[PDB]
PDB file of all heavy atoms in Angstrom:
ATOM      1  N   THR A   1       5.021  13.481  -7.473  1.00 19.40           N
ATOM      2  CA  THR A   1       4.685  14.026  -6.132  1.00 19.40           C
ATOM      3  C   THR A   1       5.119  12.976  -5.119  1.00 19.40           C
ATOM      4  O   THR A   1       5.523  11.890  -5.570  1.00 19.40           O
ATOM      5  CB  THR A   1       3.209  14.191  -5.953  1.00 19.40           C
ATOM      6  OG1 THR A   1       2.544  12.981  -5.920  1.00 19.40           O
ATOM      7  CG2 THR A   1       2.581  15.097  -7.064  1.00 19.40           C
ATOM      8  N   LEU A   2       5.092  13.332  -3.870  1.00 19.13           N
ATOM      9  CA  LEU A   2       5.446  12.428  -2.830  1.00 19.13           C
ATOM     10  C   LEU A   2       4.529  11.231  -2.804  1.00 19.13           C
ATOM     11  O   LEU A   2       4.985  10.046  -2.672  1.00 19.13           O
ATOM     12  CB  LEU A   2       5.380  13.095  -1.455  1.00 19.13           C
ATOM     13  CG  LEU A   2       5.741  12.250  -0.249  1.00 19.13           C
ATOM     14  CD1 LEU A   2       7.079  11.678  -0.339  1.00 19.13           C
ATOM     15  CD2 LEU A   2       5.589  13.086   1.038  1.00 19.13           C
ATOM     16  N   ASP A   3       3.212  11.506  -2.997  1.00 16.83           N
ATOM     17  CA  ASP A   3       2.173  10.434  -3.031  1.00 16.83           C
ATOM     18  C   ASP A   3       2.488   9.405  -4.091  1.00 16.83           C
ATOM     19  O   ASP A   3       2.383   8.203  -3.897  1.00 16.83           O
ATOM     20  CB  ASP A   3       0.814  11.064  -3.151  1.00 16.83           C
ATOM     21  CG  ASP A   3       0.286  11.607  -1.919  1.00 16.83           C
ATOM     22  OD1 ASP A   3       0.954  11.521  -0.872  1.00 16.83           O
ATOM     23  OD2 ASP A   3      -0.896  12.159  -1.952  1.00 16.83           O
ATOM     24  N   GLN A   4       2.823   9.892  -5.308  1.00 17.92           N
ATOM     25  CA  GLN A   4       3.098   9.008  -6.392  1.00 17.92           C
ATOM     26  C   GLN A   4       4.366   8.224  -6.119  1.00 17.92           C
ATOM     27  O   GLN A   4       4.387   7.019  -6.357  1.00 17.92           O
ATOM     28  CB  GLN A   4       3.251   9.845  -7.687  1.00 17.92           C
ATOM     29  CG  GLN A   4       2.015  10.624  -8.017  1.00 17.92           C
ATOM     30  CD  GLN A   4       2.044  11.491  -9.295  1.00 17.92           C
ATOM     31  OE1 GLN A   4       3.048  12.230  -9.478  1.00 17.92           O
ATOM     32  NE2 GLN A   4       1.054  11.454 -10.039  1.00 17.92           N
ATOM     33  N   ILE A   5       5.403   8.898  -5.589  1.00 15.10           N
ATOM     34  CA  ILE A   5       6.648   8.147  -5.224  1.00 15.10           C
ATOM     35  C   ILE A   5       6.276   7.098  -4.233  1.00 15.10           C
ATOM     36  O   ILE A   5       6.921   6.016  -4.286  1.00 15.10           O
ATOM     37  CB  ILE A   5       7.665   9.191  -4.714  1.00 15.10           C
ATOM     38  CG1 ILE A   5       8.105  10.141  -5.788  1.00 15.10           C
ATOM     39  CG2 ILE A   5       8.916   8.421  -4.172  1.00 15.10           C
ATOM     40  CD1 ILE A   5       9.006  11.240  -5.241  1.00 15.10           C
ATOM     41  N   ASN A   6       5.355   7.386  -3.361  1.00 19.08           N
ATOM     42  CA  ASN A   6       5.015   6.341  -2.372  1.00 19.08           C
ATOM     43  C   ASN A   6       4.324   5.185  -2.954  1.00 19.08           C
ATOM     44  O   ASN A   6       4.607   4.029  -2.584  1.00 19.08           O
ATOM     45  CB  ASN A   6       4.055   6.981  -1.239  1.00 19.08           C
ATOM     46  CG  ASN A   6       4.778   7.787  -0.203  1.00 19.08           C
ATOM     47  OD1 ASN A   6       5.908   7.417   0.150  1.00 19.08           O
ATOM     48  ND2 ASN A   6       4.101   8.815   0.285  1.00 19.08           N
ATOM     49  N   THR A   7       3.433   5.472  -3.879  1.00 15.14           N
ATOM     50  CA  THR A   7       2.728   4.409  -4.629  1.00 15.14           C
ATOM     51  C   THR A   7       3.738   3.550  -5.374  1.00 15.14           C
ATOM     52  O   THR A   7       3.599   2.217  -5.405  1.00 15.14           O
ATOM     53  CB  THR A   7       1.683   4.971  -5.640  1.00 15.14           C
ATOM     54  OG1 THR A   7       0.697   5.691  -4.883  1.00 15.14           O
ATOM     55  CG2 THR A   7       1.025   3.891  -6.404  1.00 15.14           C
ATOM     56  N   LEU A   8       4.678   4.132  -6.085  1.00 12.76           N
ATOM     57  CA  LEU A   8       5.705   3.424  -6.855  1.00 12.76           C
ATOM     58  C   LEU A   8       6.521   2.502  -5.977  1.00 12.76           C
ATOM     59  O   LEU A   8       6.666   1.240  -6.319  1.00 12.76           O
ATOM     60  CB  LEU A   8       6.579   4.331  -7.608  1.00 12.76           C
ATOM     61  CG  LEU A   8       5.983   5.033  -8.849  1.00 12.76           C
ATOM     62  CD1 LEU A   8       7.011   6.039  -9.425  1.00 12.76           C
ATOM     63  CD2 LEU A   8       5.594   4.021  -9.866  1.00 12.76           C
ATOM     64  N   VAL A   9       7.091   2.964  -4.881  1.00 14.58           N
ATOM     65  CA  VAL A   9       7.958   2.119  -4.062  1.00 14.58           C
ATOM     66  C   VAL A   9       7.210   1.095  -3.255  1.00 14.58           C
ATOM     67  O   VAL A   9       7.856   0.289  -2.623  1.00 14.58           O
ATOM     68  CB  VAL A   9       8.822   3.050  -3.083  1.00 14.58           C
ATOM     69  CG1 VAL A   9       9.565   4.081  -3.832  1.00 14.58           C
ATOM     70  CG2 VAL A   9       7.866   3.632  -1.998  1.00 14.58           C
ATOM     71  N   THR A  10       5.906   1.142  -3.330  1.00 13.54           N
ATOM     72  CA  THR A  10       5.129   0.091  -2.647  1.00 13.54           C
ATOM     73  C   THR A  10       4.498  -0.944  -3.564  1.00 13.54           C
ATOM     74  O   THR A  10       3.830  -1.837  -3.158  1.00 13.54           O
ATOM     75  CB  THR A  10       3.990   0.726  -1.749  1.00 13.54           C
ATOM     76  OG1 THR A  10       3.208   1.577  -2.590  1.00 13.54           O
ATOM     77  CG2 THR A  10       4.551   1.593  -0.634  1.00 13.54           C
ATOM     78  N   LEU A  11       4.835  -0.826  -4.855  1.00 13.94           N
ATOM     79  CA  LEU A  11       4.386  -1.782  -5.880  1.00 13.94           C
ATOM     80  C   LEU A  11       5.079  -3.096  -5.517  1.00 13.94           C
ATOM     81  O   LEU A  11       6.225  -3.076  -5.134  1.00 13.94           O
ATOM     82  CB  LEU A  11       4.751  -1.343  -7.264  1.00 13.94           C
ATOM     83  CG  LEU A  11       3.982  -0.183  -7.937  1.00 13.94           C
ATOM     84  CD1 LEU A  11       4.722   0.148  -9.262  1.00 13.94           C
ATOM     85  CD2 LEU A  11       2.579  -0.618  -8.186  1.00 13.94           C
ATOM     86  N   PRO A  12       4.371  -4.185  -5.775  1.00 15.65           N
ATOM     87  CA  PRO A  12       4.994  -5.490  -5.520  1.00 15.65           C
ATOM     88  C   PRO A  12       6.220  -5.750  -6.459  1.00 15.65           C
ATOM     89  O   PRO A  12       6.099  -5.521  -7.654  1.00 15.65           O
ATOM     90  CB  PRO A  12       3.854  -6.531  -5.809  1.00 15.65           C
ATOM     91  CG  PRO A  12       2.670  -5.690  -5.574  1.00 15.65           C
ATOM     92  CD  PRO A  12       2.984  -4.385  -6.145  1.00 15.65           C
ATOM     93  N   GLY A  13       7.336  -6.139  -5.869  1.00 10.31           N
ATOM     94  CA  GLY A  13       8.526  -6.359  -6.616  1.00 10.31           C
ATOM     95  C   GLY A  13       9.479  -5.195  -6.616  1.00 10.31           C
ATOM     96  O   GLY A  13      10.647  -5.305  -7.110  1.00 10.31           O
ATOM     97  N   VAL A  14       9.160  -4.081  -6.021  1.00  9.65           N
ATOM     98  CA  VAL A  14      10.016  -2.924  -5.876  1.00  9.65           C
ATOM     99  C   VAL A  14      10.811  -3.086  -4.606  1.00  9.65           C
ATOM    100  O   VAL A  14      10.255  -3.197  -3.530  1.00  9.65           O
ATOM    101  CB  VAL A  14       9.203  -1.563  -5.859  1.00  9.65           C
ATOM    102  CG1 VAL A  14      10.122  -0.435  -5.536  1.00  9.65           C
ATOM    103  CG2 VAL A  14       8.553  -1.372  -7.186  1.00  9.65           C
ATOM    104  N   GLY A  15      12.161  -3.043  -4.758  1.00 11.65           N
ATOM    105  CA  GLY A  15      12.986  -3.227  -3.623  1.00 11.65           C
ATOM    106  C   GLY A  15      13.906  -2.020  -3.201  1.00 11.65           C
ATOM    107  O   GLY A  15      14.689  -2.141  -2.279  1.00 11.65           O
ATOM    108  N   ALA A  16      13.823  -0.967  -3.969  1.00  9.48           N
ATOM    109  CA  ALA A  16      14.676   0.222  -3.648  1.00  9.48           C
ATOM    110  C   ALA A  16      14.298   1.399  -4.524  1.00  9.48           C
ATOM    111  O   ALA A  16      13.460   1.332  -5.507  1.00  9.48           O
ATOM    112  CB  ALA A  16      16.108  -0.089  -3.923  1.00  9.48           C
ATOM    113  N   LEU A  17      14.832   2.546  -4.164  1.00 12.83           N
ATOM    114  CA  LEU A  17      14.557   3.874  -4.841  1.00 12.83           C
ATOM    115  C   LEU A  17      15.873   4.593  -5.067  1.00 12.83           C
ATOM    116  O   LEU A  17      16.589   4.810  -4.131  1.00 12.83           O
ATOM    117  CB  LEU A  17      13.542   4.697  -4.059  1.00 12.83           C
ATOM    118  CG  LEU A  17      13.422   6.183  -4.544  1.00 12.83           C
ATOM    119  CD1 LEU A  17      12.727   6.124  -5.905  1.00 12.83           C
ATOM    120  CD2 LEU A  17      12.522   6.969  -3.566  1.00 12.83           C
ATOM    121  N   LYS A  18      16.108   5.003  -6.289  1.00 14.65           N
ATOM    122  CA  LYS A  18      17.265   5.743  -6.632  1.00 14.65           C
ATOM    123  C   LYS A  18      16.733   7.183  -6.685  1.00 14.65           C
ATOM    124  O   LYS A  18      16.116   7.608  -7.685  1.00 14.65           O
ATOM    125  CB  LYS A  18      17.897   5.405  -7.955  1.00 14.65           C
ATOM    126  CG  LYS A  18      19.142   6.186  -8.372  1.00 14.65           C
ATOM    127  CD  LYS A  18      19.679   5.735  -9.725  1.00 14.65           C
ATOM    128  CE  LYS A  18      21.006   6.303  -9.990  1.00 14.65           C
ATOM    129  NZ  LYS A  18      21.162   7.734 -10.181  1.00 14.65           N
ATOM    130  N   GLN A  19      16.958   7.933  -5.614  1.00 14.14           N
ATOM    131  CA  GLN A  19      16.502   9.321  -5.514  1.00 14.14           C
ATOM    132  C   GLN A  19      17.440  10.339  -6.117  1.00 14.14           C
ATOM    133  O   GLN A  19      18.258  10.893  -5.312  1.00 14.14           O
ATOM    134  CB  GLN A  19      16.169   9.623  -4.022  1.00 14.14           C
ATOM    135  CG  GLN A  19      15.717  11.019  -3.717  1.00 14.14           C
ATOM    136  CD  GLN A  19      14.278  11.284  -4.070  1.00 14.14           C
ATOM    137  OE1 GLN A  19      13.696  12.259  -3.723  1.00 14.14           O
ATOM    138  NE2 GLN A  19      13.708  10.340  -4.769  1.00 14.14           N
ATOM    139  N   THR A  20      17.349  10.610  -7.356  1.00 12.58           N
ATOM    140  CA  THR A  20      18.237  11.565  -7.951  1.00 12.58           C
ATOM    141  C   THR A  20      17.584  12.982  -7.960  1.00 12.58           C
ATOM    142  O   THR A  20      17.128  13.469  -8.981  1.00 12.58           O
ATOM    143  CB  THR A  20      18.618  11.114  -9.456  1.00 12.58           C
ATOM    144  OG1 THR A  20      18.964   9.723  -9.415  1.00 12.58           O
ATOM    145  CG2 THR A  20      19.813  11.909  -9.913  1.00 12.58           C
ATOM    146  N   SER A  21      17.434  13.502  -6.796  1.00 13.92           N
ATOM    147  CA  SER A  21      16.884  14.798  -6.577  1.00 13.92           C
ATOM    148  C   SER A  21      17.590  15.483  -5.401  1.00 13.92           C
ATOM    149  O   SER A  21      18.063  14.874  -4.496  1.00 13.92           O
ATOM    150  CB  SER A  21      15.387  14.609  -6.127  1.00 13.92           C
ATOM    151  OG  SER A  21      14.869  15.714  -5.531  1.00 13.92           O
ATOM    152  N   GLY A  22      17.659  16.834  -5.548  1.00 12.80           N
ATOM    153  CA  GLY A  22      18.348  17.601  -4.524  1.00 12.80           C
ATOM    154  C   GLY A  22      17.406  18.075  -3.405  1.00 12.80           C
ATOM    155  O   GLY A  22      17.819  18.785  -2.476  1.00 12.80           O
ATOM    156  N   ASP A  23      16.183  17.669  -3.448  1.00 16.99           N
ATOM    157  CA  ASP A  23      15.183  18.109  -2.505  1.00 16.99           C
ATOM    158  C   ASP A  23      15.320  17.241  -1.290  1.00 16.99           C
ATOM    159  O   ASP A  23      14.798  16.074  -1.283  1.00 16.99           O
ATOM    160  CB  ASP A  23      13.775  17.966  -3.074  1.00 16.99           C
ATOM    161  CG  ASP A  23      12.666  18.351  -2.120  1.00 16.99           C
ATOM    162  OD1 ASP A  23      12.913  18.342  -0.932  1.00 16.99           O
ATOM    163  OD2 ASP A  23      11.537  18.660  -2.594  1.00 16.99           O
ATOM    164  N   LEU A  24      16.028  17.663  -0.240  1.00 18.01           N
ATOM    165  CA  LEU A  24      16.223  16.858   0.961  1.00 18.01           C
ATOM    166  C   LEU A  24      15.070  16.886   1.928  1.00 18.01           C
ATOM    167  O   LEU A  24      15.123  16.166   2.894  1.00 18.01           O
ATOM    168  CB  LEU A  24      17.588  17.230   1.617  1.00 18.01           C
ATOM    169  CG  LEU A  24      18.746  16.878   0.754  1.00 18.01           C
ATOM    170  CD1 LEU A  24      20.045  16.892   1.599  1.00 18.01           C
ATOM    171  CD2 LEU A  24      18.647  15.546   0.133  1.00 18.01           C
ATOM    172  N   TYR A  25      14.042  17.715   1.617  1.00 20.69           N
ATOM    173  CA  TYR A  25      12.875  17.665   2.491  1.00 20.69           C
ATOM    174  C   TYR A  25      12.147  16.430   2.099  1.00 20.69           C
ATOM    175  O   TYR A  25      11.696  15.653   2.951  1.00 20.69           O
ATOM    176  CB  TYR A  25      12.005  19.017   2.216  1.00 20.69           C
ATOM    177  CG  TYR A  25      10.618  18.925   2.792  1.00 20.69           C
ATOM    178  CD1 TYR A  25      10.353  18.322   4.061  1.00 20.69           C
ATOM    179  CD2 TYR A  25       9.537  19.613   2.177  1.00 20.69           C
ATOM    180  CE1 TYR A  25       9.108  18.334   4.627  1.00 20.69           C
ATOM    181  CE2 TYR A  25       8.249  19.633   2.727  1.00 20.69           C
ATOM    182  CZ  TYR A  25       8.025  19.027   3.968  1.00 20.69           C
ATOM    183  OH  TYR A  25       6.799  19.054   4.524  1.00 20.69           O
ATOM    184  N   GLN A  26      11.964  16.234   0.746  1.00 18.81           N
ATOM    185  CA  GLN A  26      11.281  15.050   0.287  1.00 18.81           C
ATOM    186  C   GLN A  26      12.076  13.756   0.643  1.00 18.81           C
ATOM    187  O   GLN A  26      11.494  12.718   0.856  1.00 18.81           O
ATOM    188  CB  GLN A  26      11.130  15.179  -1.248  1.00 18.81           C
ATOM    189  CG  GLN A  26      10.512  13.923  -1.864  1.00 18.81           C
ATOM    190  CD  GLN A  26      10.278  14.094  -3.364  1.00 18.81           C
ATOM    191  OE1 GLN A  26       9.312  14.718  -3.852  1.00 18.81           O
ATOM    192  NE2 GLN A  26      11.163  13.560  -4.174  1.00 18.81           N
ATOM    193  N   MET A  27      13.408  13.857   0.639  1.00 20.21           N
ATOM    194  CA  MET A  27      14.200  12.687   1.007  1.00 20.21           C
ATOM    195  C   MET A  27      13.849  12.258   2.377  1.00 20.21           C
ATOM    196  O   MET A  27      13.733  11.051   2.670  1.00 20.21           O
ATOM    197  CB  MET A  27      15.689  13.036   0.950  1.00 20.21           C
ATOM    198  CG  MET A  27      16.653  11.927   1.312  1.00 20.21           C
ATOM    199  SD  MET A  27      16.847  10.638   0.049  1.00 20.21           S
ATOM    200  CE  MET A  27      18.087  11.488  -0.990  1.00 20.21           C
ATOM    201  N   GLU A  28      13.657  13.247   3.291  1.00 22.04           N
ATOM    202  CA  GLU A  28      13.310  13.009   4.695  1.00 22.04           C
ATOM    203  C   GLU A  28      11.893  12.392   4.767  1.00 22.04           C
ATOM    204  O   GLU A  28      11.564  11.559   5.607  1.00 22.04           O
ATOM    205  CB  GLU A  28      13.389  14.243   5.490  1.00 22.04           C
ATOM    206  CG  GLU A  28      13.178  14.055   7.051  1.00 22.04           C
ATOM    207  CD  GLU A  28      11.660  13.928   7.420  1.00 22.04           C
ATOM    208  OE1 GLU A  28      10.798  14.646   6.815  1.00 22.04           O
ATOM    209  OE2 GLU A  28      11.398  13.218   8.422  1.00 22.04           O
ATOM    210  N   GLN A  29      11.010  12.915   3.943  1.00 22.50           N
ATOM    211  CA  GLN A  29       9.622  12.480   3.879  1.00 22.50           C
ATOM    212  C   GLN A  29       9.523  11.050   3.409  1.00 22.50           C
ATOM    213  O   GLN A  29       8.632  10.301   3.911  1.00 22.50           O
ATOM    214  CB  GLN A  29       8.739  13.352   3.001  1.00 22.50           C
ATOM    215  CG  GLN A  29       8.642  14.798   3.490  1.00 22.50           C
ATOM    216  CD  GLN A  29       7.893  15.692   2.521  1.00 22.50           C
ATOM    217  OE1 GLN A  29       8.393  15.926   1.383  1.00 22.50           O
ATOM    218  NE2 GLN A  29       6.744  16.172   2.856  1.00 22.50           N
ATOM    219  N   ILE A  30      10.387  10.699   2.514  1.00 22.49           N
ATOM    220  CA  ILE A  30      10.368   9.316   1.973  1.00 22.49           C
ATOM    221  C   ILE A  30      10.873   8.399   3.099  1.00 22.49           C
ATOM    222  O   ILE A  30      10.270   7.319   3.294  1.00 22.49           O
ATOM    223  CB  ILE A  30      11.240   9.196   0.743  1.00 22.49           C
ATOM    224  CG1 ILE A  30      10.618  10.041  -0.431  1.00 22.49           C
ATOM    225  CG2 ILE A  30      11.385   7.762   0.316  1.00 22.49           C
ATOM    226  CD1 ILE A  30      11.517  10.122  -1.640  1.00 22.49           C
ATOM    227  N   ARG A  31      11.964   8.710   3.719  1.00 26.64           N
ATOM    228  CA  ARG A  31      12.531   7.888   4.805  1.00 26.64           C
ATOM    229  C   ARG A  31      11.497   7.712   5.962  1.00 26.64           C
ATOM    230  O   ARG A  31      11.377   6.625   6.544  1.00 26.64           O
ATOM    231  CB  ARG A  31      13.840   8.528   5.345  1.00 26.64           C
ATOM    232  CG  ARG A  31      14.332   7.892   6.680  1.00 26.64           C
ATOM    233  CD  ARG A  31      14.540   6.350   6.486  1.00 26.64           C
ATOM    234  NE  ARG A  31      15.634   6.045   5.563  1.00 26.64           N
ATOM    235  CZ  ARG A  31      15.635   4.957   4.835  1.00 26.64           C
ATOM    236  NH1 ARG A  31      14.645   4.128   4.775  1.00 26.64           N
ATOM    237  NH2 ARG A  31      16.672   4.733   4.000  1.00 26.64           N
ATOM    238  N   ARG A  32      10.823   8.780   6.248  1.00 25.72           N
ATOM    239  CA  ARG A  32       9.854   8.829   7.343  1.00 25.72           C
ATOM    240  C   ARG A  32       8.667   7.851   7.019  1.00 25.72           C
ATOM    241  O   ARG A  32       8.202   7.066   7.829  1.00 25.72           O
ATOM    242  CB  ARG A  32       9.275  10.253   7.533  1.00 25.72           C
ATOM    243  CG  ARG A  32       8.195  10.406   8.602  1.00 25.72           C
ATOM    244  CD  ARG A  32       8.465  11.603   9.498  1.00 25.72           C
ATOM    245  NE  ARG A  32       8.696  12.861   8.704  1.00 25.72           N
ATOM    246  CZ  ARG A  32       7.679  13.607   8.226  1.00 25.72           C
ATOM    247  NH1 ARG A  32       6.432  13.262   8.398  1.00 25.72           N
ATOM    248  NH2 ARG A  32       7.932  14.709   7.497  1.00 25.72           N
ATOM    249  N   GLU A  33       8.214   7.918   5.764  1.00 24.48           N
ATOM    250  CA  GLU A  33       7.133   7.015   5.303  1.00 24.48           C
ATOM    251  C   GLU A  33       7.552   5.537   5.089  1.00 24.48           C
ATOM    252  O   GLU A  33       6.772   4.679   5.249  1.00 24.48           O
ATOM    253  CB  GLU A  33       6.552   7.604   4.055  1.00 24.48           C
ATOM    254  CG  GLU A  33       5.377   6.786   3.508  1.00 24.48           C
ATOM    255  CD  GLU A  33       4.138   6.914   4.357  1.00 24.48           C
ATOM    256  OE1 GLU A  33       4.084   7.803   5.229  1.00 24.48           O
ATOM    257  OE2 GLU A  33       3.124   6.130   4.060  1.00 24.48           O
ATOM    258  N   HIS A  34       8.818   5.399   4.802  1.00 24.84           N
ATOM    259  CA  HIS A  34       9.345   4.009   4.547  1.00 24.84           C
ATOM    260  C   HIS A  34      10.656   3.738   5.316  1.00 24.84           C
ATOM    261  O   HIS A  34      11.731   3.767   4.737  1.00 24.84           O
ATOM    262  CB  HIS A  34       9.596   3.848   3.040  1.00 24.84           C
ATOM    263  CG  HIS A  34       8.417   4.224   2.267  1.00 24.84           C
ATOM    264  ND1 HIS A  34       7.296   3.394   1.994  1.00 24.84           N
ATOM    265  CD2 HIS A  34       8.139   5.369   1.496  1.00 24.84           C
ATOM    266  CE1 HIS A  34       6.430   4.065   1.234  1.00 24.84           C
ATOM    267  NE2 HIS A  34       6.968   5.214   0.943  1.00 24.84           N
ATOM    268  N   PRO A  35      10.470   3.346   6.620  1.00 22.23           N
ATOM    269  CA  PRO A  35      11.558   3.047   7.505  1.00 22.23           C
ATOM    270  C   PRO A  35      12.657   2.063   6.943  1.00 22.23           C
ATOM    271  O   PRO A  35      13.816   2.163   7.206  1.00 22.23           O
ATOM    272  CB  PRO A  35      10.918   2.609   8.792  1.00 22.23           C
ATOM    273  CG  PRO A  35       9.651   3.341   8.816  1.00 22.23           C
ATOM    274  CD  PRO A  35       9.224   3.164   7.313  1.00 22.23           C
ATOM    275  N   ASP A  36      12.125   0.999   6.314  1.00 20.60           N
ATOM    276  CA  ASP A  36      13.024  -0.043   5.787  1.00 20.60           C
ATOM    277  C   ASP A  36      13.444   0.056   4.298  1.00 20.60           C
ATOM    278  O   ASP A  36      14.209  -0.804   3.801  1.00 20.60           O
ATOM    279  CB  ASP A  36      12.409  -1.427   6.046  1.00 20.60           C
ATOM    280  CG  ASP A  36      11.885  -1.553   7.501  1.00 20.60           C
ATOM    281  OD1 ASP A  36      12.648  -1.205   8.408  1.00 20.60           O
ATOM    282  OD2 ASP A  36      10.788  -2.123   7.676  1.00 20.60           O
ATOM    283  N   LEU A  37      13.011   1.137   3.643  1.00 21.20           N
ATOM    284  CA  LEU A  37      13.335   1.344   2.256  1.00 21.20           C
ATOM    285  C   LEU A  37      14.801   1.539   1.909  1.00 21.20           C
ATOM    286  O   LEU A  37      15.460   2.308   2.571  1.00 21.20           O
ATOM    287  CB  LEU A  37      12.505   2.426   1.698  1.00 21.20           C
ATOM    288  CG  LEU A  37      12.765   2.812   0.162  1.00 21.20           C
ATOM    289  CD1 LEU A  37      12.318   1.654  -0.713  1.00 21.20           C
ATOM    290  CD2 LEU A  37      12.054   4.101  -0.203  1.00 21.20           C
ATOM    291  N   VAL A  38      15.272   0.848   0.922  1.00 20.57           N
ATOM    292  CA  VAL A  38      16.674   1.041   0.415  1.00 20.57           C
ATOM    293  C   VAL A  38      16.534   2.319  -0.402  1.00 20.57           C
ATOM    294  O   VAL A  38      15.871   2.395  -1.408  1.00 20.57           O
ATOM    295  CB  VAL A  38      17.130  -0.162  -0.492  1.00 20.57           C
ATOM    296  CG1 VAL A  38      18.478   0.236  -1.176  1.00 20.57           C
ATOM    297  CG2 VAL A  38      17.274  -1.389   0.355  1.00 20.57           C
ATOM    298  N   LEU A  39      17.190   3.378   0.121  1.00 22.43           N
ATOM    299  CA  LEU A  39      17.108   4.678  -0.460  1.00 22.43           C
ATOM    300  C   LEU A  39      18.468   5.244  -0.886  1.00 22.43           C
ATOM    301  O   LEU A  39      19.205   5.692  -0.009  1.00 22.43           O
ATOM    302  CB  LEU A  39      16.405   5.659   0.529  1.00 22.43           C
ATOM    303  CG  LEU A  39      16.043   7.043   0.086  1.00 22.43           C
ATOM    304  CD1 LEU A  39      15.031   7.020  -1.034  1.00 22.43           C
ATOM    305  CD2 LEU A  39      15.390   7.774   1.323  1.00 22.43           C
TER     306      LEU A  39
END
């Protein structure tokens, strides 16, 4: 879920996310929640 993805990318030591999904609504939600995230 988006919440779980949020928890994962905020774990200490995590520096990026490889989003292999065609859901571009979620892609936007991830960017919105994490402005500086390497996506």
